[PDB]
Motif scaffolding. Structure first.
Motif, mmCIF file in Angstrom:
data_model
loop_
_atom_site.group_PDB
_atom_site.id
_atom_site.type_symbol
_atom_site.label_atom_id
_atom_site.label_comp_id
_atom_site.label_asym_id
_atom_site.label_seq_id
_atom_site.Cartn_x
_atom_site.Cartn_y
_atom_site.Cartn_z
ATOM 1 N N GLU B 30 18.600 86.621 95.730
ATOM 2 C CA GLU B 30 17.327 86.300 96.439
ATOM 3 C C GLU B 30 17.604 85.877 97.900
ATOM 4 O OE1 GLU B 30 13.436 84.129 94.436
ATOM 5 O OE2 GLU B 30 15.373 82.969 94.143
ATOM 6 N N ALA B 31 18.781 85.305 98.173
ATOM 7 C CA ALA B 31 19.072 84.634 99.466
ATOM 8 C C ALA B 31 19.578 85.657 100.475
ATOM 9 C CB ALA B 31 20.090 83.544 99.288
ATOM 10 N N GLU B 59 16.050 80.874 100.645
ATOM 11 C CA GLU B 59 15.056 80.630 101.693
ATOM 12 C C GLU B 59 13.829 79.967 101.071
ATOM 13 O OE1 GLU B 59 17.984 82.996 102.645
ATOM 14 O OE2 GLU B 59 16.379 84.058 101.588
ATOM 15 N N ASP B 62 11.712 81.259 97.973
ATOM 16 C CA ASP B 62 12.580 81.734 96.869
ATOM 17 C C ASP B 62 12.479 80.748 95.688
ATOM 18 O OD1 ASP B 62 13.404 83.753 98.642
ATOM 19 O OD2 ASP B 62 15.494 83.112 98.758
HETATM 20 CA CA LIG Z 1 15.016 85.142 100.097
#
Ligand SMILES: [Ca+2]
Ligand SMILES: CC(=O)N[C@H]1CN2/C(=N/Cc3ccccc3)SC[C@@H]2[C@@H](O)[C@@H]1O
Ligand SMILES: CC(=O)N[C@H]1CN2/C(=N/Cc3ccccc3)SC[C@@H]2[C@@H](O)[C@@H]1O
Lengths: 714, 708
Positions: B30-31, B59, B62
């Motif tokens: 996700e990051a 982030e 997320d």
């Molecule tokens: Ca993200």
């Protein structure tokens, strides 16, 4: 120091004369014009008048010196020289003697003033000078012009041209005339040699491929005729350092006698005819004695035979010269292999000339020195040989060494003395020849240091001497680098001067380590020494990169061992006192080697050009089953080959040789027999690690004669 | 020290945890992938689903960092970072913020341990970085790849490409697309900038030959389109250091607004659009103010305007930045001309970053440094500017300098500090900009010298301070020369390191001369010093031989003047004590100048490139009949010409030339008002002589040019 070479007879008065403001010159039109030219230059802007001080110059028999014919020594190149208040006399026994009287006169002249003096002088040895006879880069044309002028000043009458690597002298083009450029240069050297009263002796070295037939005999005489057309009036044939049919002494003698009878004795004006034998020293002479007695008995007696002494590199003794003279039936024409450095090209040989018997002048036809490829650097030895050969009975090794240095570099004589005093030994070499170095400081060194390894306080003065010596070394290095009086000398020695300054800096820091009061200060000096070790490595890898002994070694006899041993000791003591693990290694090596073989593990690696090698071992190597050696380079390089010699001249059945880039994945490389050793081509394969393992079940006994990785050149 | 730039908010618990040998990771998919890559490279340890402390990266928005979302600063490039026994949190407000949390995290990690800490952080200034904007040899491609990696580590988000001497940046070839080789290199730099969270800003400098027509407008847009095809997403137009119609501010504003409307706002993903004005500093700008108010009024508001301060070379003050901001109607985007050395090319500028107000973050849109052509050497200042621009309120000049040096050369940090401390001033220059140097030793130097000159005894401690300095200088020089941790840094500085070691050796010998001892010892030290002067002369005449400021100067502010004055003084004292005539000259000069004229004879010769000249005098130009100034060169050289000036319009002098100083040829001087000149058409020259061949008696310039 007054006069070099020192005259046979000298009587000085404690009265001094002015170089006369006004002079009557008697004999100027008839005396040797080379001598008259020197006189006129010395009398520049003085008054030539029909009623001034009488200056008489001439050869014996000339109207000008009839009056003094009883004072002129009756020897070839002899002269009588007189200075009093009435007049000056410059009287040669022959034209060259008149020139030599002027070379003495020139040294007597000190700031317009002359000593009142009586001189009767002549040389003890008939032919005196230099053979440019070494392996390596021949002397430049400008260096040779400088040499010939220096010979004239020092009364050397012989220059034997024979650089081993001149292709028109040796292999393979001795048959060919010099190209126009080189031929014009040789013609100029001959004219300059004549103007300095030097015999230019052109040598040829045809032996490695000569056929004993008409074709090659005629090409040799045709080459001699071309050299004669360039002005050459003395000739030599060299048969040294050859193999094969060209070593036949009967054929050598027949060729030299043919040259003698058809050329040397047919021209009106050929002076020297010289040969260098195949057996040119006692050690390499065959015990049946037949080679040398064949030359002795067959070569026409006017022909000279050269000799280097009891070994390839040796000093001349009474016993040694008696030994040769008995076999060649004439007095040997000495070829003295000093200061030639062509087998120790990483060393300068700047020390005094010594070791030759001073009583054997009657036993030699001639005496020439084979010098370094560094022409100006060789002047120290050349000046000293000139002095020895002219007056061996009065030869003063150490004063002559000092006089030479003061002549060569008057502006920096003490700095050049400092540098030369510590750049005189050859180090270990295959010919076994050594010289003294750093003898003055050696006692203060030996006991500042056998003491340190064991005992006590050692002495404030065996610390001030070593500190003083390093300080003087740096002053000398920096003044020499910037000296503009002899730029060609400074170009030759500059790489060594850099290394000499770094040696002196490393010594100063290592002494600061010994004086070391706190841990912090000690580590600062330690880190500084490690950096100076690295800098010396880089000078060694970037300077003087020849194929034989690349790089730059200096102060090797005493100073480098003192500094290296003192650093290793003071580091051991620091590690003991502080339970530290400082590295005591004295030579920087960017690559690494590990072994579990007792006789290999402590052998240093060396870098020579694009080779990385294990220093060959003296001792028998005991290589246990499974034991190995591994080299790790500082980076991945393309590999060329690996060469190994275990002293067997046989396949190595027990060993596995492997390379790797990571020391995890190995590739086996196959050793093949080549020229009595083992060789494996690497075909540019990337290499960082090299490994050799005993994969047999048995201990192996070998010598580590060679273990070398070659990597792709920069 | 522990963090650079220092974060906005830091709470440390003076407790330690081990970097986890086994850890669980939430938010890897996700990051920001650039952040996740840094983390995975730091985590020597095995990822588990079931055992070990939890690491959360992501982030804001997320799911991985939902728990921590109100802790995340609501600022562009902001982040929250937390370490405790239970978990590690790396939470950006945006993707670049997450990458910045990782650049802070990397610095916390010490010998496999972390401190227990909570951090809330964000930049005080929006755009921070470097403009490669100098005259001289542009940075190499390898240098630029190194720079972009360093910018990401130090949270510099901007690299403005604009080397004055790149022919595809400036006139006339700004019109031409980059050749294929260079285009491929620029495409690689943009990709590497992106991987390091740096905006690559491509600048163009078209103003010296721009036509305000369709042809040049289209060629400029076509050039921007080609750079966009290589990946560039930020753009600049520079109008600095030009003359002619390209200085028109209305035409500049029209062109930038056209770029904005037709290109910057038409592409989906252009970030910065920046202009550098013709009037880019207060002094250089028009006293009527019309130029800057035209830009402020007419340039579209999204367009940044660059400014170098009150002068071409200046530090940024509150009054200065207020003055410009009032006129351009927006916060200035600072172009800080340090450590740029392109006007002092014989000096390295390795000192600290100081002089910029630490309270004016709200008054600047951006802050970029213009560095030296020595890329690695510039990292001391770049690191410090990154620290300043991120957190000006906490900016610590000296600690940041030390931290930069220990970051750049950890293997020889004290040796680099020694070299940099004594290589920081610019020396006198046309722009009047100076920096401090050797401030540690300045008091001991000033005292030692004040004493020694007017015969009082100097403090033992101060002699010792100077001896210690010279000793450290030699150690540093020899360790740096051999350093292999940053080979490219050592290549840049090597000529200066050689000169620095000679300076230190000269100092040591000059102090041994002061200690005096005996006459023969003094003479040995004297002769050693003259050799070291000669070696310094040869480095200065043979290294860094550029057309502008050739050679290599070092330790110029305090140390070299101290050594030169101490030498001249101890030689004056020795000459008196022994009625000797030793030369007290401190600069080696291989040529000789002999004159039986008064205000001339003591003027030192100078060598610069292929010129040998008499130092001009500001004194008495009084010249007796039959008198001569004679120069003896160290050798015969082909003569190029002679230029002579007395400061009047005007037949009393005979200029003559010789290879031997016996046979003399005359040379006739042409005349253009004050300027006396004669070409020598490659004539051999060793002696030059100017005689007064008049009945009567009677130096702005006396300059011989030879062939090199
Ligand atoms: Ca993200
Ligand atoms: C007559 C004479 O001196 N010739 C040579 C001898 N020598 C060398 N020869 C090489 C050699 C290798 C192995 C065994 C014996 C000799 S090296 C120094 C000198 C070299 O200058 C010289 O020209
Ligand atoms: C925007 C900017 O800073 N542009 C230039 C200014 N400058 C210099 N200019 C030279 C000059 C000479 C005479 C009069 C004014 C300016 S030298 C240093 C810097 C140079 O790096 C830089 O690109």
């Amino acid at each position: 120091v007054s006069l070099q070479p020192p005259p046979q007879q000298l009587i000085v008065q404690n009265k001094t004369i002015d170089l006369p403001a006004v002079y009557q010159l008697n004999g100027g039109e008839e005396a040797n014009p080379h001598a008259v030219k020197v006189l006129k230059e010395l009398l520049s802007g003085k008054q030539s008048s029909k009623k001034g001080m009488l200056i008489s110059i001439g050869e014996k028999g000339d109207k000008s010196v009839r009056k003094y014919s009883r004072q002129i020594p009756d020897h070839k190149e002899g002269y009588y020289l007189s200075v009093n208040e009435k007049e000056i006399v410059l009287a040669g026994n022959d034209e060259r003697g008149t020139y030599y009287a002027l070379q003495t006169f020139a040294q007597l002249l000190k700031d317009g003033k002359l000593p009142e003096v009586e001189i009767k002088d002549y040389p003890s040895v008939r032919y005196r000078g230099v053979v440019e006879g070494f392996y390596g880069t021949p002397w430049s044309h400008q260096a040779r012009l400088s040499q010939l002028k220096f010979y004239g000043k020092n009364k050397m009458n012989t220059y034997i041209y024979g650089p081993k690597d001149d292709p028109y002298h040796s292999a393979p083009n001795w048959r060919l005339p010099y190209p126009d450029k080189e031929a014009a240069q040789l013609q100029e050297l001959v004219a300059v040699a004549n103007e300095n009263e030097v015999d230019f002796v052109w040598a040829i070295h045809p032996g490695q491929d000569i056929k004993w037939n008409k074709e090659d005999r005629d090409l040799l005489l045709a080459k001699f005729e071309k050299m004669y057309q360039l002005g050459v009036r003395s000739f030599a044939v060299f048969f040294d350092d050859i193999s094969g049919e060209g070593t036949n002494p009967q054929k050598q003698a027949e060729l030299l006698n043919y040259i003698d009878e058809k050329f040397a004795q047919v021209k009106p004006d050929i002076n020297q005819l010289v040969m260098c034998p195949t057996e040119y020293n006692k050690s390499w002479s065959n015990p049946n004695g037949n080679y040398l007695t064949t030359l002795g008995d067959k070569l026409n007696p006017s022909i000279q035979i050269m000799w280097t002494g009891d070994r390839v590199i040796s000093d001349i003794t009474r016993d040694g010269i008696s030994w040769i003279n008995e076999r060649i039936k004439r007095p040997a024409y000495i070829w003295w292999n000093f200061p030639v450095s062509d087998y120790v090209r990483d060393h300068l040989l700047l020390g005094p000339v010594y070791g030759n018997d001073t009583t054997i002048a009657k036993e030699m036809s001639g005496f020439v020195t084979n010098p370094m490829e560094h022409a100006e650097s060789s002047k120290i030895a050349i000046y000293s040989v000139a002095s020895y050969a002219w007056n061996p009975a009065k030869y003063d090794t150490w004063q002559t060494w000092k006089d030479a240095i003061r002549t060569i570099l008057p502006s920096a004589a003490e700095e050049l003395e400092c540098f030369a005093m510590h750049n005189s030994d050859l180090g270990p070499n295959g010919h076994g020849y050594r010289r003294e170095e750093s003898m003055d400081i050696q006692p203060a060194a030996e006991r500042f240091l056998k003491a340190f390894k064991e005992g006590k306080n050692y002495d404030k003065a065996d610390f001030e001497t070593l500190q003083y010596t390093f300080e003087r070394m740096k002053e000398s290095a920096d003044i020499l680098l910037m000296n503009t009086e002899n730029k060609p000398l400074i170009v030759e020695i500059t790489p060594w001067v850099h290394q000499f300054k770094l040696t002196a800096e490393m010594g100063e820091e290592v002494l600061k380590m010994v004086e070391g009061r706190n841990e912090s200060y000690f580590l600062r000096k330690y880190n500084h020494v490690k950096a100076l070790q690295q800098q010396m490595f880089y000078i060694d890898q970037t300077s003087n990169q020849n194929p034989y002994q690349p790089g730059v070694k200096t102060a090797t006899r005493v100073i480098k061992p003192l500094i290296d041993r003192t650093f290793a000791t003071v580091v051991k003591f620091f590690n003991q006192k502080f339970n530290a693990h400082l590295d005591a290694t004295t030579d920087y090596m960017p690559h690494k080697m590990i072994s579990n073989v007792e006789q290999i593990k402590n052998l240093p690696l060396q870098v020579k050009a694009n080779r990385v090698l294990i220093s060959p071992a003296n001792e028998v190597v005991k290589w246990a089953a499974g034991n190995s050696v591994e080299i790790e380079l500082d980076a991945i390089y393309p590999g060329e080959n690996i060469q190994i010699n275990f002293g067997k001249d046989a396949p190595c059945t027990w060993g596995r040789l492997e390379i790797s880039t990571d020391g995890k994945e190995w590739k086996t490389v196959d050793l093949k027999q080549k020229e009595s050793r083992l060789s494996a081509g690497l075909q540019k394969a990337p290499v960082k690690f090299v490994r050799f393992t005993n994969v047999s079940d048995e201990e192996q006994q070998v010598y580590l004669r060679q273990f070398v990785l070659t990597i792709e050149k920069k």
